[PDB]
Design an enzyme around this catalytic site. Structure first.
Site, PDB file in Angstrom:
ATOM      1  N   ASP A   1     -11.297 -47.426 -33.088  1.00 24.72           N
ATOM      2  CA  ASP A   1     -10.546 -46.488 -33.900  1.00 24.72           C
ATOM      3  C   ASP A   1     -10.181 -45.339 -32.979  1.00 24.72           C
ATOM      4  OD1 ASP A   1      -9.648 -44.561 -35.745  1.00 24.72           O
ATOM      5  OD2 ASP A   1     -11.473 -44.591 -36.904  1.00 24.72           O
TER       6      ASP A   1
ATOM      7  N   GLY B   1      -2.070 -11.667  -5.095  1.00 23.17           N
ATOM      8  CA  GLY B   1      -2.626 -10.835  -6.129  1.00 23.17           C
ATOM      9  C   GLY B   1      -3.282  -9.517  -5.773  1.00 23.17           C
TER      10      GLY B   1
ATOM     11  N   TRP C   1     -23.906 -43.194 -40.567  1.00 23.46           N
ATOM     12  CA  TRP C   1     -24.183 -44.510 -41.177  1.00 23.46           C
ATOM     13  C   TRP C   1     -24.341 -44.513 -42.680  1.00 23.46           C
ATOM     14  CZ3 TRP C   1     -24.235 -49.229 -38.666  1.00 23.46           C
ATOM     15  CH2 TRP C   1     -24.198 -49.182 -37.253  1.00 23.46           C
TER      16      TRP C   1
ATOM     17  N   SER D   1       0.820  -1.228   0.000  1.00 26.44           N
ATOM     18  CA  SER D   1       0.000   0.000   0.000  1.00 26.44           C
ATOM     19  C   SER D   1       0.849   1.270   0.000  1.00 26.44           C
ATOM     20  CB  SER D   1      -0.916   0.037   1.229  1.00 26.44           C
ATOM     21  OG  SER D   1      -1.776   1.173   1.186  1.00 26.44           O
TER      22      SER D   1
ATOM     23  N   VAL E   1      -3.220  -5.538 -10.223  1.00 27.49           N
ATOM     24  CA  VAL E   1      -2.054  -4.633 -10.196  1.00 27.49           C
ATOM     25  C   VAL E   1      -0.834  -5.361  -9.598  1.00 27.49           C
ATOM     26  CG1 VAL E   1      -1.093  -2.425  -9.377  1.00 27.49           C
ATOM     27  CG2 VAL E   1      -3.472  -2.485 -10.089  1.00 27.49           C
TER      28      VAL E   1
ATOM     29  N   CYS F   1     -19.592 -52.673 -32.913  1.00 27.95           N
ATOM     30  CA  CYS F   1     -18.300 -52.486 -32.253  1.00 27.95           C
ATOM     31  C   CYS F   1     -18.522 -52.363 -30.762  1.00 27.95           C
ATOM     32  CB  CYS F   1     -17.561 -51.231 -32.757  1.00 27.95           C
ATOM     33  SG  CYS F   1     -17.059 -51.203 -34.510  1.00 27.95           S
ATOM     34  N   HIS F   2     -19.664 -51.806 -30.384  1.00 26.84           N
ATOM     35  CA  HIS F   2     -20.039 -51.687 -28.984  1.00 26.84           C
ATOM     36  C   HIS F   2     -20.868 -52.866 -28.632  1.00 26.84           C
ATOM     37  CE1 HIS F   2     -20.138 -47.605 -30.968  1.00 26.84           C
ATOM     38  NE2 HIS F   2     -18.883 -47.745 -30.478  1.00 26.84           N
TER      39      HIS F   2
ATOM     40  N   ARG G   1     -15.319 -53.981 -28.858  1.00 27.56           N
ATOM     41  CA  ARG G   1     -14.469 -55.006 -29.462  1.00 27.56           C
ATOM     42  C   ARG G   1     -13.369 -54.440 -30.388  1.00 27.56           C
ATOM     43  NH1 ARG G   1     -14.931 -55.644 -34.889  1.00 27.56           N
ATOM     44  NH2 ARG G   1     -16.900 -54.863 -35.741  1.00 27.56           N
TER      45      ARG G   1
ATOM     46  N   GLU H   1     -28.165 -40.197 -33.402  1.00 32.90           N
ATOM     47  CA  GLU H   1     -27.889 -41.635 -33.529  1.00 32.90           C
ATOM     48  C   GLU H   1     -28.435 -42.428 -32.334  1.00 32.90           C
ATOM     49  OE1 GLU H   1     -23.773 -43.033 -32.953  1.00 32.90           O
ATOM     50  OE2 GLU H   1     -24.098 -44.500 -34.566  1.00 32.90           O
TER      51      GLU H   1
ATOM     52  N   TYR I   1     -27.917 -52.213 -33.924  1.00 32.29           N
ATOM     53  CA  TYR I   1     -28.155 -51.749 -32.552  1.00 32.29           C
ATOM     54  C   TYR I   1     -29.601 -51.567 -32.101  1.00 32.29           C
ATOM     55  CZ  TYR I   1     -23.164 -50.690 -32.439  1.00 32.29           C
ATOM     56  OH  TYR I   1     -21.792 -50.767 -32.454  1.00 32.29           O
TER      57      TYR I   1
HETATM   58  N1  LIG Z   1      -9.397 -14.367  -9.005  1.00 34.75           N
HETATM   59  C1  LIG Z   1      -8.343 -14.249  -8.204  1.00 34.75           C
HETATM   60  O1  LIG Z   1      -7.502 -15.115  -8.206  1.00 34.75           O
HETATM   61  C2  LIG Z   1      -8.105 -13.009  -7.367  1.00 34.75           C
HETATM   62  C3  LIG Z   1      -7.041 -12.935  -6.447  1.00 34.75           C
HETATM   63  C4  LIG Z   1      -6.834 -11.749  -5.717  1.00 34.75           C
HETATM   64  C5  LIG Z   1      -7.688 -10.658  -5.921  1.00 34.75           C
HETATM   65  N2  LIG Z   1      -8.699 -10.770  -6.797  1.00 34.75           N
HETATM   66  C6  LIG Z   1      -9.605  -9.666  -7.061  1.00 34.75           C
HETATM   67  O2  LIG Z   1      -8.868  -8.593  -7.651  1.00 34.75           O
HETATM   68  C7  LIG Z   1      -9.445  -7.328  -7.284  1.00 34.75           C
HETATM   69  C8  LIG Z   1      -8.391  -6.462  -6.594  1.00 34.75           C
HETATM   70  O3  LIG Z   1      -7.272  -6.323  -7.491  1.00 34.75           O
HETATM   71  P1  LIG Z   1      -6.769  -4.872  -7.980  1.00 34.75           P
HETATM   72  O4  LIG Z   1      -5.657  -4.916  -8.999  1.00 34.75           O
HETATM   73  O5  LIG Z   1      -7.975  -3.975  -8.215  1.00 34.75           O
HETATM   74  O6  LIG Z   1      -6.135  -4.388  -6.597  1.00 34.75           O
HETATM   75  P2  LIG Z   1      -4.811  -4.989  -5.946  1.00 34.75           P
HETATM   76  O7  LIG Z   1      -3.844  -5.331  -7.066  1.00 34.75           O
HETATM   77  O8  LIG Z   1      -5.217  -5.945  -4.852  1.00 34.75           O
HETATM   78  O9  LIG Z   1      -4.293  -3.660  -5.185  1.00 34.75           O
HETATM   79  C9  LIG Z   1      -3.721  -2.536  -5.839  1.00 34.75           C
HETATM   80  C10 LIG Z   1      -3.219  -1.677  -4.686  1.00 34.75           C
HETATM   81  O10 LIG Z   1      -2.184  -2.318  -3.920  1.00 34.75           O
HETATM   82  C11 LIG Z   1      -1.194  -1.366  -3.544  1.00 34.75           C
HETATM   83  N3  LIG Z   1       0.045  -1.554  -4.328  1.00 34.75           N
HETATM   84  C12 LIG Z   1       0.210  -2.322  -5.416  1.00 34.75           C
HETATM   85  N4  LIG Z   1       1.475  -2.263  -5.900  1.00 34.75           N
HETATM   86  C13 LIG Z   1       2.155  -1.436  -5.104  1.00 34.75           C
HETATM   87  C14 LIG Z   1       3.546  -0.929  -5.036  1.00 34.75           C
HETATM   88  N5  LIG Z   1       4.491  -1.314  -5.937  1.00 34.75           N
HETATM   89  N6  LIG Z   1       3.836  -0.067  -4.033  1.00 34.75           N
HETATM   90  C15 LIG Z   1       2.914   0.320  -3.132  1.00 34.75           C
HETATM   91  N7  LIG Z   1       1.642  -0.094  -3.127  1.00 34.75           N
HETATM   92  C16 LIG Z   1       1.209  -0.960  -4.074  1.00 34.75           C
HETATM   93  C17 LIG Z   1      -1.802  -0.028  -3.884  1.00 34.75           C
HETATM   94  O11 LIG Z   1      -2.617   0.309  -2.758  1.00 34.75           O
HETATM   95  P3  LIG Z   1      -2.838   1.855  -2.351  1.00 34.75           P
HETATM   96  O12 LIG Z   1      -3.933   2.320  -3.280  1.00 34.75           O
HETATM   97  O13 LIG Z   1      -3.235   1.835  -0.901  1.00 34.75           O
HETATM   98  O14 LIG Z   1      -1.490   2.492  -2.602  1.00 34.75           O
HETATM   99  C18 LIG Z   1      -2.634  -0.347  -5.105  1.00 34.75           C
HETATM  100  O15 LIG Z   1      -3.681   0.588  -5.351  1.00 34.75           O
HETATM  101  C19 LIG Z   1     -10.626  -7.695  -6.418  1.00 34.75           C
HETATM  102  O16 LIG Z   1     -11.744  -7.803  -7.303  1.00 34.75           O
HETATM  103  C20 LIG Z   1     -10.309  -9.071  -5.873  1.00 34.75           C
HETATM  104  O17 LIG Z   1     -11.504  -9.793  -5.561  1.00 34.75           O
HETATM  105  C21 LIG Z   1      -8.916 -11.887  -7.516  1.00 34.75           C
HETATM  106  O1  LIG Z   2     -18.644 -46.547 -32.996  1.00 29.12           O
HETATM  107  C1  LIG Z   2     -17.642 -46.961 -33.598  1.00 29.12           C
HETATM  108  C2  LIG Z   2     -17.817 -47.615 -34.807  1.00 29.12           C
HETATM  109  C3  LIG Z   2     -16.688 -48.067 -35.472  1.00 29.12           C
HETATM  110  N1  LIG Z   2     -15.448 -47.898 -34.951  1.00 29.12           N
HETATM  111  C4  LIG Z   2     -14.308 -48.379 -35.759  1.00 29.12           C
HETATM  112  C5  LIG Z   2     -13.389 -49.477 -35.210  1.00 29.12           C
HETATM  113  C6  LIG Z   2     -12.879 -50.107 -36.511  1.00 29.12           C
HETATM  114  O2  LIG Z   2     -11.790 -49.364 -37.068  1.00 29.12           O
HETATM  115  C7  LIG Z   2     -14.026 -49.952 -37.505  1.00 29.12           C
HETATM  116  C8  LIG Z   2     -14.861 -51.231 -37.566  1.00 29.12           C
HETATM  117  O3  LIG Z   2     -13.891 -52.246 -37.812  1.00 29.12           O
HETATM  118  P1  LIG Z   2     -14.147 -53.822 -37.844  1.00 29.12           P
HETATM  119  O4  LIG Z   2     -13.563 -54.243 -36.541  1.00 29.12           O
HETATM  120  O5  LIG Z   2     -15.637 -54.005 -38.000  1.00 29.12           O
HETATM  121  O6  LIG Z   2     -13.278 -54.244 -38.995  1.00 29.12           O
HETATM  122  O7  LIG Z   2     -14.790 -48.831 -37.045  1.00 29.12           O
HETATM  123  C9  LIG Z   2     -15.311 -47.210 -33.702  1.00 29.12           C
HETATM  124  O8  LIG Z   2     -14.220 -46.985 -33.128  1.00 29.12           O
HETATM  125  N2  LIG Z   2     -16.412 -46.778 -33.083  1.00 29.12           N
END
Ligand SMILES: NC(=O)c1ccc[n+]([C@@H]2O[C@H](COP(=O)([O-])OP(=O)(O)OC[C@H]3O[C@@H](n4cnc5c(N)ncnc54)[C@H](OP(=O)(O)O)[C@@H]3O)[C@@H](O)[C@H]2O)c1
Ligand SMILES: O=c1ccn([C@H]2C[C@H](O)[C@@H](COP(=O)(O)O)O2)c(=O)[nH]1
Ligand SMILES: Nc1nc(=O)c2c([nH]1)NCC(CNc1ccc(C(=O)N[C@@H](CCC(=O)O)C(=O)O)cc1)=N2
Ligand SMILES: O=c1ccn([C@H]2C[C@H](O)[C@@H](COP(=O)(O)O)O2)c(=O)[nH]1
Lengths: 543, 530
Positions: free
Chosen positions: B438, B144, B329, B107, B147, B415-416, B435, B307, B355
């Site tokens: 492919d 994360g 077919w 921050s 940013v 085949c099935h 049996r 099918e 079938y």
């Molecule tokens: N899906 C996921 O995996 C996942 C994971 C984590 C978060 N999230 C989501 O991501 C969102 C938040 O991410 P965001 O990018 O908006 O915010 P963020 O990256 O969490 O925070 C950015 C803030 O962190 C501080 N900061 C970052 N780099 C800095 C540096 N080099 N020096 C000093 N301070 C630094 C600053 O705070 P200050 O403004 O106080 O300076 C900056 O405004 C939310 O929606 C959260 O739910 C998702």
């Molecule tokens: O649903 C199917 C129908 C056919 N085959 C393939 C296997 C064989 O290459 C060929 C049938 O060969 P024979 O064993 O009947 O020669 O079609 C499949 O993998 N799945």
């Protein structure tokens, strides 16, 4: 107060496979972390080589970060009280392990190679290849070196004699999910000493699945971070969460750092329905917590996505699939094989409440199988002959995939609107779509209604297996299964069981194996399917 | 060498911007304040955002900032807020100073003595700087004032801008400065929201631990760069890749395009053109907050609504669609096309049972497009509406066109494929599954169609629409679409629009084209996908 492994950053890195018992598992094998304990056989690895494990070993043991070293340097020198001591890691090993390595790439590139031994003398080697006399003199050598981290790369004994000396901050542990002949084994990790803090994606290499876990020693522009917080301004941060479920409950689930195992796509959905689900009533009148629309993807080329945080069975669900493929609608066929998935939906009582008073018991009407093979045919009863009646969709998609793979019409649809009321119940699995690129098949399944606790674990499996089936008969590799969930619900009576399940750590996934001789979709039989290396937690009764 | 001030003292801006009481650009949103307050008054949501941002403090980080500022000068925690003083004055008293902040107020026109509050007052930007020098604070927000935002931006003291786009228009008288695009560029975009009857979003402009190794380890098997496919150059998506946060829901679609271009697969297709394609995607769209009509190019909904109404009526007559100048077919009804489908006895534009017909008459025998189909087939549409009304917790509320029996009689398939509905707490969601998609041309329309359809159904069932959820099967990009899609992917989406329906329509059959309005559609320019 600072500890040695904490100061010097000593970690263990290893790989363990499964080990065969001569005693054939006449009862159900029990699995735990110790299941993966096989280290070596006849001075070499039990699986000979694994090119992805080998890439991971290299990657981990050679990676260095120079920008985080000072703190380590300051830690270490200040711990030693002193002020003064290309950055690389230390790899520590036993004599046998060092001899196991082929000379061509021995010493181990880009690493400070240490070798524990009592018959080796420094005379026979070099300066950059440190020889050590005993466990005590490593800490001494680590005080005089510049290194990033220190990795104990093994020998059964070495690992054994480091873990009981509590010199290991973390264990980088590869789970090789397959069995081999073994003479040496990794020690048994104590759940009170270490705990798993991370689990990797699941991978296939060298014919096995594998994943990478991390054990941890227990305790017994900058301003881009703020913008993030701003974008979260509209949440409800609290103590009490919707549905009355506590912190205590998911201790182990929540304690993991990295949870990249694909099973976590199912578990994380459960977690999410528990933490955030809507309390709703339902048709069954039990109550659910529900959510709507999820998608998971599973890479079928790397694993079979069978849930490992409880025990799953697959005979029944494979039989159902074969039954669908045959176009059957007769529930008696499944009941006679003791597959009872459809039993409750075929009773007199259930059919009458569906207003199907003139329907025979276990005659389920024109459900999946009928729709896949005869869409548009007039349903009479489950004994009629429908040969060449209606549209055989299953056949049509198989032909499209083979002849017209870039079509976008490769669909298999169960949801026949005209026939819905005649079905014992309408399909949960509405449709499958297919996609083919570069020799690879992917499938999308749309599920309108998903019982996360009981139904969805099986549903993932069914359609994964089906994607393999379709791929194989069309000469393609399976790529992705893509599960789309519509109404995704956890039943209330599953909540306690799912709480137990969410605090269990997945094991690397199993693999599915189809009889390769089968080349048409209708030729599969129950013995054509194998699951391998299914390592799983104990069974859970959900209800 | 030497620092700008905004950097040393962390100085920002925050803001909110609406649209101001068509070509669209950023400056569209610039409304800051109105009549010393906010242009929209209040937004609750934005406020809340603001408070949240500007009060939030990280204690741990200050000592690093203290040193910085003390080195530059040679030498409970709060923010500063800086605001312009106007912005200070717009804060309601009971909110001053912003609470819990130092308030600074720029921050020139206010000083400390003018404030009761505890606040600093400064009268210079320069003083803010001096003050920041003296204070202990976290950040400084420039909140994360336009940013305040401007000068701080001009001094170049803002490092960034926090910017809210409040999408509505209001009366404004102050504005945020146009941001220079040369100095600031958008680096982030939020989700889209509704508050206090508007959509919004939030964007950001910019001025132009042991486990970490384990992560490197678990990435040991990922590719190199050069291996990752297609002819795609970095310069082509520089804006798209410039963005730090991409939270707008349209990115769900765009990211899928991107993904198909970089990583898609080259495939032939029924058409001959070829595609880049990928398989399986999902998109979610919250209809209570937005209508998801793409924004990065211009789309119309009249046709696809017509099918859809044609579907709901049950029609199949292409002339009805052509008379409303909807040509979805058309190509599929020509003489030529019907002949190529083998439909030699179909009148031109009679698409057949597609079938509409499936939804109202599934299962009826199709004759021609003029026939009266009254009470024939299943009226699915009617049923799903009844289910939603009377059995909302049903998990069977689906509508399906993929009638397998009728596929060939359709001009082309569906085949099935389907729709599924879901109801909770008075709210309606829908998933559709496709049996074929492919991306370039069919998908954007299909998203729309069904989202609309979800609305229609929700309404006539007295619900509120919630999520459309789309699922893609074959998802493709046609090559002729690539250059047009490279352009589109560098456009920044805008906040989505909303869809409003005449609230007096209470039955699904009563909707007319004029009952639909699209509001606040902000979109980039038409593209021919040529
Ligand atoms: N899906 C996921 O995996 C996942 C994971 C984590 C978060 N999230 C989501 O991501 C969102 C938040 O991410 P965001 O990018 O908006 O915010 P963020 O990256 O969490 O925070 C950015 C803030 O962190 C501080 N900061 C970052 N780099 C800095 C540096 N080099 N020096 C000093 N301070 C630094 C600053 O705070 P200050 O403004 O106080 O300076 C900056 O405004 C939310 O929606 C959260 O739910 C998702
Ligand atoms: O649903 C199917 C129908 C056919 N085959 C393939 C296997 C064989 O290459 C060929 C049938 O060969 P024979 O064993 O009947 O020669 O079609 C499949 O993998 N799945
Ligand atoms: N984005 C934004 N939105 C805004 O609303 C805003 C902005 N930025 N930067 C700076 C700014 C400056 N405007 C205002 C007005 C009132 C309050 C306020 O009362 N704020 C209180 C309430 C917040 C609340 O209660 O929600 C606060 O304490 O912030 C704040 C700023 N507002
Ligand atoms: O394979 C299946 C079968 C059923 N369900 C579940 C979903 C629902 O809990 C119930 C089906 O009944 P409606 O959703 O149709 O009422 O069963 C599945 O998850 N997977």
């Amino acid at each position: 107060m600072e500890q040695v492994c904490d100061v010097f950053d000593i970690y263990a890195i290893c790989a363990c496979c499964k080990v065969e018992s001569k005693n054939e598992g006449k009862k159900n094998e029990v699995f735990n972390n110790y299941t993966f304990r096989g280290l070596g056989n006849k001075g070499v690895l039990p699986w000979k080589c694994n090119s992805l494990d080998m890439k991971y070993f290299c990657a981990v043991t050679t990676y260095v970060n120079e920008s985080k070293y000072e703190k380590l340097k300051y830690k270490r020198c200040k711990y030693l009280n002193k002020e003064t001591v290309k950055l690389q890691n230390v790899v520590v090993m036993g004599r046998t392990s060092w001899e196991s390595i082929p000379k061509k790439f021995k010493p181990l590139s880009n690493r400070i190679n240490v070798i524990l031994s009592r018959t080796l003398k420094k005379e026979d080697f070099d300066e950059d290849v440190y020889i050590i006399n005993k466990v005590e003199d490593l800490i001494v050598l680590l005080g005089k070196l510049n290194y990033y981290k220190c990795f104990i790369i093994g020998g059964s004994v070495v690992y054994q004699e480091f873990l009981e000396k509590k010199l290991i901050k973390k264990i980088y542990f590869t789970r090789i999910n397959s069995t081999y002949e073994c003479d040496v084994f990794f020690p048994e990790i104590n759940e009170n000493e270490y705990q798993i803090i991370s689990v990797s994606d699941v991978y296939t290499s060298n014919n096995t699945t594998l994943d990478f876990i991390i054990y941890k020693k227990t305790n017994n522009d900058d301003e881009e971070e703020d913008d993030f917080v701003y974008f979260n301004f509209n949440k409800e941060k609290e103590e009490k969460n919707k549905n009355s479920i506590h912190p205590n409950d998911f201790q182990i689930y929540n304690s993991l750092k990295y949870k990249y195992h694909p099973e976590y796509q199912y578990l994380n959905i459960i977690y999410d329905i528990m933490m955030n689900g809507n309390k709703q009533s339902d048709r069954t009148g039990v109550g659910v917590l529900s959510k709507f629309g999820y998608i998971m993807k599973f890479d079928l080329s790397q694993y079979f996505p069978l849930l490992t945080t409880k025990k799953l069975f697959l005979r029944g669900i494979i039989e159902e699939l074969l039954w669908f493929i045959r176009g059957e609608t007769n529930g008696n066929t499944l009941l006679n094989k003791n597959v009872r998935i459809w039993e409750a939906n075929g009773t007199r009582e259930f059919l009458d409440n569906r207003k199907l008073f003139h329907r025979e018991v276990n005659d389920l009407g024109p459900i999946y199988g009928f729709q896949w093979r005869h869409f548009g045919a007039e349903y009479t009863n489950m004994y009629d002959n429908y040969e060449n009646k209606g549209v055989d969709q299953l056949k049509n998609i198989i032909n499209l995939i083979k002849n017209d793979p870039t079509s976008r019409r490769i669909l298999l649809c169960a949801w026949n609107v005209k026939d819905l009321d005649q079905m014992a119940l309408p399909p949960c699995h509405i449709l499958c779509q297919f996609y083919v690129f570069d020799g690879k098949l992917s499938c999308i399944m749309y599920q309108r209604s998903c019982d996360l606790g009981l139904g969805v674990p099986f549903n993932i499996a069914s359609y994964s297996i089906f994607t393999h089936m379709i791929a194989q008969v069309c000469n393609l590799q399976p790529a992705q299964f893509i599960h789309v969930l519509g109404n995704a619900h956890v039943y209330n009576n599953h909540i306690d069981s799912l709480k137990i399940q969410l605090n269990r750590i997945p094991y690397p996934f199993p693999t599915l194996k189809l009889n390769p001789d089968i080349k048409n979709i209708e030729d599969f039989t129950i013995s054509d399917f194998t699951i391998q290396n299914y390592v799983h937690h104990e069974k859970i009764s959900m209800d």
